[PDB]
Symmetry: C5
Subunit: 264 residues, 5 copies
Amino acid sequence: IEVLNLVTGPDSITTIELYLNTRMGQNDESKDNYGYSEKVTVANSSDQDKPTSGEIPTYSTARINLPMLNTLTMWEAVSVKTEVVGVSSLVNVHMATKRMYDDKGIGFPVEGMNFHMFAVGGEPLELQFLTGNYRTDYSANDKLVVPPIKHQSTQGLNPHYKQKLTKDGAFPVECWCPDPSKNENTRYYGSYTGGQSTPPVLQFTNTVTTVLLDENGVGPLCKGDGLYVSCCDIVGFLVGKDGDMQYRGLPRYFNILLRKRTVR
Amino acid sequence: NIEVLNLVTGPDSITTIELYLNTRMGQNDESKDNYGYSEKVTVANSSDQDKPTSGEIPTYSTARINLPMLNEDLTCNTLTMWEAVSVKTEVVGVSSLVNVHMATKRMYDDKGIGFPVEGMNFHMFAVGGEPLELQFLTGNYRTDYSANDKLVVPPIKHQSTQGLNPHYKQKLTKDGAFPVECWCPDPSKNENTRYYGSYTGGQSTPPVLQFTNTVTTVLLDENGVGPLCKGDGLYVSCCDIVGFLVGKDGDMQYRGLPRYFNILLRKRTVRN
Amino acid sequence: IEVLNLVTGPDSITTIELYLNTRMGQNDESKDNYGYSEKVTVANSSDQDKPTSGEIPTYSTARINLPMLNEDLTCNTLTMWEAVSVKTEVVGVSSLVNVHMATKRMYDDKGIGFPVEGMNFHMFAVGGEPLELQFLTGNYRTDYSANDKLVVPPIKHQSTQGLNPHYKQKLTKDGAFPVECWCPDPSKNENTRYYGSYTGGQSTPPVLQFTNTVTTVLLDENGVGPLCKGDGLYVSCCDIVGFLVGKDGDMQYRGLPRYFNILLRKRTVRN
Amino acid sequence: EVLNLVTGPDSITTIELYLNTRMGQNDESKDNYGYSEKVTVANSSDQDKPTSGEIPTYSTARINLPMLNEDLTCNTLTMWEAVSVKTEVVGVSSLVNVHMATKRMYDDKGIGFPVEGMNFHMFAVGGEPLELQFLTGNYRTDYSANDKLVVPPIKHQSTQGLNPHYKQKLTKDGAFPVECWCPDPSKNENTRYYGSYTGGQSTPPVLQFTNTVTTVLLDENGVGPLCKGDGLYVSCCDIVGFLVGKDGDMQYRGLPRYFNILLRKRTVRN
Amino acid sequence: IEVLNLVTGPDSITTIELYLNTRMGQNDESKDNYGYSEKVTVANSSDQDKPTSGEIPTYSTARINLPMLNTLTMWEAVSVKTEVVGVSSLVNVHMATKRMYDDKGIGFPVEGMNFHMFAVGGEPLELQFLTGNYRTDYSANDKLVVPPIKHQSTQGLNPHYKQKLTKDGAFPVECWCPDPSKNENTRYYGSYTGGQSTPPVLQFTNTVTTVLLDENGVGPLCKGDGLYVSCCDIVGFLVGKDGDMQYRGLPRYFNILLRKRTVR
Ligand SMILES: CC(=O)N[C@H]1[C@H]([C@H](O)[C@H](O)CO)O[C@@](OC[C@H]2O[C@@H](O)[C@H](O)[C@@H](O)[C@H]2O)(C(=O)O)C[C@@H]1O
Ligand SMILES: CC(=O)N[C@H]1[C@H]([C@H](O)[C@H](O)CO)O[C@@](O)(C(=O)O)C[C@@H]1O
Ligand SMILES: CC(=O)N[C@H]1[C@H]([C@H](O)[C@H](O)CO)O[C@@](O)(C(=O)O)C[C@@H]1O
Ligand SMILES: CC(=O)N[C@H]1[C@H]([C@H](O)[C@H](O)CO)O[C@@](O)(C(=O)O)C[C@@H]1O
């Protein structure tokens, strides 16, 4: 796309506000364990690694239809204000959990692994397959989107194994990451803090704007008047009384500012 | 909805408001033992029977401060409003955590220090021209709050509240009443409030705290406009959990600290 | 104080250099255990919480007299010293690189001695008058009467576990005001700048820096530093770097000294 | 001695690549790719002989740049100058996996141990091979279980510090060992390198990924790496921790790294 | 020194490159255990605290002769690029050490206390004595430089106990620190991260320049055309099979830029 001048004047800006609920594994808001995974199970061996249905976190994603337009004009994403919602819900140590100090102390708070990422773009987020175990069998849940073939080389980067993030709550985070060789029209940001019982470290404010313009002063350009938003926000595990553990995720809010851009 | 006009200049066009808010950890009566702590934490028998005892639940601190009355005639073409420009805020009493002789569990086979207050930290404050707007979100939709009918929670529960369900909202209008565990700032609203928060979890995590009288937080938005104080009210809210006190037998209580605010405001003309 | 212009020209600047030794509880430089507290003891209950003499860290403080400025008091203005900036450092950080002292040790009596570790508390203040204090304690019933030299309120009340503004003081004596129950009063201290940090936990790694290259600006938002009333400069601090763990598990606070180099300038004010 | 930038058509070029990790099992057609073989421990310092495949090595490639004239009799010549790089660790999200066949938490009821522990991350971009200094924790380490590793032919006590007689160039992928070769700070004037180490036993990995960060390769004088012989040299290592097997056996885990490098033509004196 | 203007023209700049090997206790490069301390021992009581020979880290230092000059002209140190060398050597978990998970897991990596300092000056680093134990007896090693008299007050700052860092591998870190009341003509930078088994956190790059100019734009001025460089870099302890522990140190590289300065 050949990018020309900005369109000036009264109707040249618009904003899109949305939230995405977490996709930790039980993703139906009417059913038990919503906002958590099902209980984590552990493979007996690498060739018998078959996660149960609902124990696998997946990416949240939405495509938002933008106001009608129409050299052509496209919406250009300029900036985003994004927040993790419900951080204070983690201030809860009276749930039915394992507890400290010979059954007398606090319940374990949600703790452990944190994974936080978001992406804003003008087309679907482009994905690269990469897994800790090439033999992982996802057949317990046919709604997951994974490659049809398995190969040893996918424990590294094999560029024959790619996808696009086109469906909410379906692409496992454990085997799909952003493709850094593409995504020219998307901006993504992510972080991982691992370990077993690591303290979650989280912030929330309504005062931070993230600029989405690239080094040339150009934001994501919304092809077919679609804005694509994606994320995942794992805040740790809930540890049940018997030691069974579930992923816990939180929703993410977005407020995206867009402007009209003339293109050739 | 408020159309903002020009700043009123000259002398007397600025004012400052100073206050502190004491912590609301659960034992919130300053005349009783255990003030500034929660009651001992208990743990649910099951997720269906999750009923916190009265006073074991931290809540937000909040106040509405009356500002100097600007308008004798409320039917004038324009009016003057107080606009919050900046705030200096600090947690008070951080040095009180340098205490390891209290009646607590202790290190090294009963020969070492008492356990200092440690574990989960949660710090937030908000300054606005109207009450802080809240979104309900909980780790357990079934939590039963009926042991304390002074708490403000939604009148019905549903599975979906373990995520973001925008049908469950509120406004922070009462001190010591809205549980932190189920109410958070609503990011889809709060156009006229600025809020800042952090959480550091884990079981016995070291508290990491700072205090100074030299830091100013700017409250002006992207357009150079601060919170506008509707009806000459300034709304300040916070929560500062610094960890748990571990008693001799392992029983634990939240510990909170007060927060101080020094807010600078200026007169702004607005359309009436 | 109505602050007017800076005084220019020769001798319009001066510097003050000092250090303050730590006041961890054993505060006599001629005695063993200097720079440490006495052994920490622990209350059996909150109504029998009575620290032993010397187990309680207190603030260090000094007043430094500055060159006199105002012989004439009948004129429209006066001159005050204004503290512009300070270079401050904790001294002796390298002394913590010591794992052969008589301490508990790692790995079934084969490994290193425990280094000094655990709680860190670091604060300093520079002002033109004594640091103003607010009382706040983790236990309102703490009985300080084993050491009557500690400056504490004469009465106890439940409300002092939060902020009760009827319980205030000024830091007017070195090695006497417990850090555990006195903090800076944020509603005052207009003429002081203070900076503090706390890192808690049981055996937490101390994280410490030392350099002679950092200047802290003491000017406020209006460009005005602390103004030294009666030509007095007040400097206060506390620097706890953790606990020494003895062989049997007995523990003592360890503190370090703090160095200060303060730049001051002459400022005209209204009389 | 650099002169001015060349201007005009085809005076800019870009190089895009990735490097797969070299943790020890470096064959993409076999099981356990991107991990080391099981770690073993020496009985004593004089019999410290790592097994074949348990030792991470640097990843490296030389990339051909568009060919320029190299006549040694010319007054000036053109060279490619590397200006900036965008680089990211790939597959960080793969660490969100606690159902692998691993030791597990809470009396065999909790999560599998995630990959955790030591992190080592470094990359380099230069106009010649990365210059290496030998330095080891044990001068007597015996590398003879794998003769494909590049190590010095003689061992000496001084190599537990910096002995400048023990140097190399990073000229082969998967060969190299990280444990005994580091970037030489006394050379590498024509390379930029960046590295970090976080140690400990079960330390949480802390990792970030984004496509929004550009690393400037220009030095204090405004000059980037100059590509001798029209070669661009890219090197890295990204260890993200250990996988802990059911019986406590442990393997290094590494991740690939992506690079996008911008270059421009620079006139130099000859 | 009254500082005047910079000298301009050819040969007004020079650079000095060097490295300093660590002085952890076994400081002979021909012997086993070079770059480590001897095994750490622990006093039975504070009045019988007598470290063994070689278990005590000391500062590394050097004086470098600069090109001869000669108002007078002096060399002024402007900036330094400095790096800890051999960080990657800590990626080694097969040494003869204690190991994880019931003798099946990795050897313990070098871990625990980190201490990092360097100084660049135009005269010797000025030191202040301060110790955790005034009674420490250094007589097992007569090559160490320590005060001849012991006193209780030396557990705080006693300004009657000072020295200058004039000998490599002789001044113990545990009782000598930079004197903040002097060192006007030196820049020093240090950090300590303590604890028992703390993860070392270390960086290495050839892209960072440390500016040595003070608030007045003046760097260290090299008296008698001597440049003084000092450091210590403790990266943790090596834990032997039986639990015996030794300090591990790493060398430090310096590239210092100097310029000619006119002085009165
Ligand atoms: C903070 C506090 O109250 N300290 C007490 C201390 C502690 O109660 C105890 O040492 C635990 O660390 O006890 C002190 O008295 C010790 C003394 O107490 C009597 O009750 C008992 O009969 C004696 O045998 C002996 O235990 C102490 O000095 O340690 C007093 C101190 O106030
Ligand atoms: C969170 C919760 O449900 N708390 C309940 C507790 C705990 O189940 C136990 O004390 C175990 O800690 O038991 C009570 O009888 C009590 O102590 O008053 C009722 C209370 O509602
Ligand atoms: C670093 C080292 O020397 N490893 C050696 C190991 C270990 O001593 C044991 O496996 C204990 O882990 O023993 C070997 O027989 C082996 O496993 O093949 C030889 C190998 O050289
Ligand atoms: C710091 C100290 O005083 N070390 C002393 C040690 C220790 O008391 C024990 O070894 C316990 O580690 O005992 C010695 O006999 C020794 O080992 O050579 C003498 C030495 O002076």
